[PDB]
Every structure is written in C-alpha cells, then in structure tokens.
Design a protein around this nucleic acid. Sequence first.
DNA 1: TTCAAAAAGTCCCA
DNA 2: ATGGGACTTTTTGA
Length: 546
Amino acid sequence: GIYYTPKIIVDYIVKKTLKNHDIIKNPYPRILDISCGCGNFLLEVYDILYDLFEENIYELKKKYDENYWTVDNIHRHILNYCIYGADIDEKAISILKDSLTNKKVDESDIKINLFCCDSLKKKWRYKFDYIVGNPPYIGHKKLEKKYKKFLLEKYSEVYKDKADLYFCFYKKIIDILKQGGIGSVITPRYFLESLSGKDLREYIKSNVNVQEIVDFLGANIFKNIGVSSCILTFDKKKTKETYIDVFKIKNEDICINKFETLEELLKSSKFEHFNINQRLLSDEWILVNKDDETFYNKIQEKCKYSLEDIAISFQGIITGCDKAFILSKDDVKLNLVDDKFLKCWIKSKNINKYIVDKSEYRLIYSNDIDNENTNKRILDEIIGLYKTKLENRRECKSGIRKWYELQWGREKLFFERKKIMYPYKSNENRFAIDYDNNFSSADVYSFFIKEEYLDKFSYEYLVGILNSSVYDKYFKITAKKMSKNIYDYYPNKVMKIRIFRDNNYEEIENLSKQIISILLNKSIDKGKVEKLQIKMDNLIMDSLGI
DNA sequence: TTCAAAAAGTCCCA
DNA sequence: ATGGGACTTTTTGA
Ligand SMILES: CC(C)(C)OC(=O)N1CCC(CCCNc2ncnc3c2ncn3[C@@H]2O[C@H](CO)[C@@H](O)[C@H]2O)CC1
Ligand SMILES: [K+]
Ligand SMILES: [K+]
C-alpha cells in the first residue's frame, strides 16, 4: 500500500510551495507531509531547504543570533524546526528517519518530527506553513466498514455516500494549513467532476484560494496503476486575486519524462493553459478554455429542455452473480429453462451509434420462479452451481432475497419496451434505439420518453442529435474523465444534457431514420452513413448557432 | 423497498 | 517482463 510518485512531479510540487519563501523573514517554516511514506517528498524538501539556508547563511547570521546561524548547524535546524511527517506504516517512518539522519555525517541525538499515526485521527497541536504529498486513495467498496462509520460521523462535510478516503485528506490538509500557507498535492482527478466530490469541491472553494490545477486527464502517471491524476495547489493568503491557472493536457499518450522538469511540459504545446475565476465556480467546476465556454453557454441557453425533463432513466439489472444467471444463447442448459424466463442480454460493447448488436447472451429472470420444487432442474443444474456465492449477497444474508433470485431485478416492463440505451463508459457518444426488449447489466443505461413529451420528441430525433459531433463535444465538456479515451456515461450527467426543438427538427429526424435504415441492412453501405452524419452535424450547428 | 455511483479499475498480449 | 489496448461486476450508501 505504498505508491511511488514520479520524481519529476515530486520536484514540481516542492518547488511550487517553497520557491518564493522568504527565508530571511521566516527562517522557521513548517513543511508537512501527512502520508509521507518513505519520504519521497520530505527528502526533496530537505534538499530545497538546505540550499535555501546555505544561500543566505551570512544574511541570517547578521540579522539573528550569529552563533546559531552557521552552515554546520543547518542540518540540525531543518530537522528540529522545519520537516514534519506522518504515516500509518511503522516501517516507512523508520526508513525515512534513517534517510533524514544520513543527510549529514552521536553528537546530540537530533529529534526528528516524524509521527507513526493515523493522520485523520491525530490531534494536531499546531498548523503548518507548507503541506505537500500524495494521500491514500480508497473507494467505497474497498474501505473498511468500521472506519467508514468514523469518516461518515467526523468528516461528513466532505465524506458521504460513495466518497473516497482522499476527500478527508483534502479536508485535513486545509484545516491544519497556516493562514498564508501553501498546499500542493497529487490526488485522483475524479473529484473535479464526480457527484461524490460536490461537497469536497464546495469545501475547497470556500476555504482556500486554488492557485493552480494540473489535469493529466487519462495519462498514466503511476505505472501499472489504473488511476487518473491531477495536481492541486492552494493557499490561505489574503488576496483580491480569485483566478486559477489551469493546465490541461492535450495528448494523453505522452510520457511524463519528456523534459527534465514538469514546468517545461506545462509551458509546451503538450499542455493548454487558461484561467478560471474561482468566484464564478458553481457546485460544478467547468474548467474549459474561452472557446469551449462560449460553445457550452450557447447550447445551454438555446436548449429549453433537458433529458431529465423529457425522459425516465434507469440503471440495468444487477444480478449479483452474472455467471449464475447469464448463459450463452447456444448453451444446451437453456433447454432446461422455459422461454418465459429468458430475456435477451447485451453488454456495453454491443451498443453502437443508433442501433444495438444482436444479442448473444440470455438472462434467466429467476424472480419469476415461484418455488424450488416446481423448477428444481433450473436451480439444481444452473443457478445452484453458485449457491454459496449467491448466499453471500447482502439481501440474501438479510433474507430479503431468495438465494436464487436476482439481487436487483428492477422492473421488467421498463426493459420490455422501445427505449434508448448507451454504454456506461465510452470514448464517444453511443446512443442506440433498442427494438428488441434487450436487458443488460449496469454497464448499459436505458431511458424512455415520457408519454407527455412523445409529440415533441421522437427516439429517432434524439439519437440523431445525441450521436452528433456537436453533442459528443458538448457532453465531454462536463463529463467525468475516467481513463485514457474513457468517459463515464452515467445518468447523473447524461440526464443533464440539454436538447432543443426548432425548424430543423424534421430534416434532422429524417436523416437519422436514413442512417438507421442503412445500419439495419444486410449489405451495409457504411460509407453513406458518415456523409449523412456530416449533413446532420451541419443542421445541428446551424440550429445552435455555433 | 429498491434506487444508482464507484476506476490507486481488471485482464490480456506482444 | 512491461506498457498499452479492450472492456467492464457487484458492492454499497441512501
Ligand atoms: C482494507 C484496506 C483498504 C487495506 O484498508 C482499509 O480499509 N483501512 C486502512 C486504514 C484506514 C486508513 C487510514 C488513513 N490514515 C493514514 N494516515 C497516515 N498515513 C496513511 C494513512 N492511510 C494511508 N497512509 C499512508 O499513505 C501512503 C499512501 O501512498 C502510504 O505510505 C500509507 O502508509 C482505513 C481502513
Ligand atoms: K547578529
Ligand atoms: K490513467
């Protein structure tokens, strides 16, 4: 559970907080890392501080105690008054203690301010000038349940529902940061857009001044780690300034060590830079350049409806054990199952633009099985092969579900109707019309149009605009970026997409029906579909005035 | 009773 | 062996 931050990022974060520190004015800066590990950040802090003191050793000697300020005394002064570290791992602190001690060449047994503790429970006796480092990330599934109760009770300002452990480290860092202090950390990027991060975003915006945000998007910063990273730099300085430097990466395929320093990367064409007024941040942080802000605001103002206004959204089936209930449509065991129980089953990859692939899997809607005596063959030979795992599901342990029932079987009538489906994680907008009463797991989301909006919006019109290049860019402006070429397509953002209705409605709908007709042909003239899409994008851009 | 969010994703291969 | 690409379960708080 120890993750190594790349050196180029560590050096950037330390320089970000210390490069303009006035060591003459304050020769006693407290620099802290509350998840210091073996000292990836703190050992670099020592080097930066040592050069800082040695460069002004004669100025300090003249201004202050001239016997105290010598070069030979810098090592002791840094460890006594400047470097602070905390980490839950006892071995890590022991290694870091040796590394700090070995920075020089017993004399007086210098004390080092290293604490082996839970940084979220430690009674911190004072505040700190500078805080740097890389907190632990633990999501809602992997976090220990007894610990979560403590977080939900004591960190409720930032931690509710499906929040993450690193939310609480943001709160702790902000709380123990001195007035006028500077904090700089690398964390997952997801809180910038996620629904769970709403409270954390409010806490940051209303308690610190966010100096800078470096968004690496889907770039792989930690080798062999499936996480997407950002660097946040904030202060508690009294300033009329309210603008954030945002550095957004332009190419996710880059390797982080192109230059000797990170700031060479940021100033280069590999990144784009723009400013955001912190006072203009709503509960959402829309961090885009001026052209995209103009683009986004044009669509928002022009569109009088949202998907949430006109549609009913729902998540797919959650069986709780797919292997027990999902079978290949050619499996001989389906001869045991009455066709009244079988539903068509698709995965996220089966969703294309405008249409769904033919299903290859079947779902046993086991909720319709009355008792274990009438359909013993289905239970004994198919579902019962996983009875132990099925019995461990939460609702089976409480008795709410029978061991053979689907955990969250939803309502069949919601799936057995004309509806629009889209994958939950995709590189692009892929909204399809489902004609085949397809069921799916939670990797596919569905919606249908409310009865009172059927005379204003058709499914054919909706998939037309939703799959357009305009709406692909439009959705991605606020979408949750997960990994390289993957965005979350979840209702908490998809249903906030705004839609319009104007004079181009009939032609847009007609072009969509032509596309659907071609896509359903045996000899798909796939080429003409692209041309029809280009014409539709022109109509949509004409409609939205972009 | 029953919804929907959550990548220190997961897994495979050249 | 690693790095990159294809693809995505069920646990969980509310
Ligand atoms: C099952 C599993 C997920 C493994 O566990 C848990 O469900 N618990 C773990 C314990 C607590 C969390 C304690 C938080 N308080 C911590 N206080 C100080 N340092 C910490 C803390 N957590 C992690 N570090 C350090 O951060 C670095 C990560 O780079 C490492 O050097 C790591 O040692 C929550 C419950
Ligand atoms: K003096
Ligand atoms: K990534």
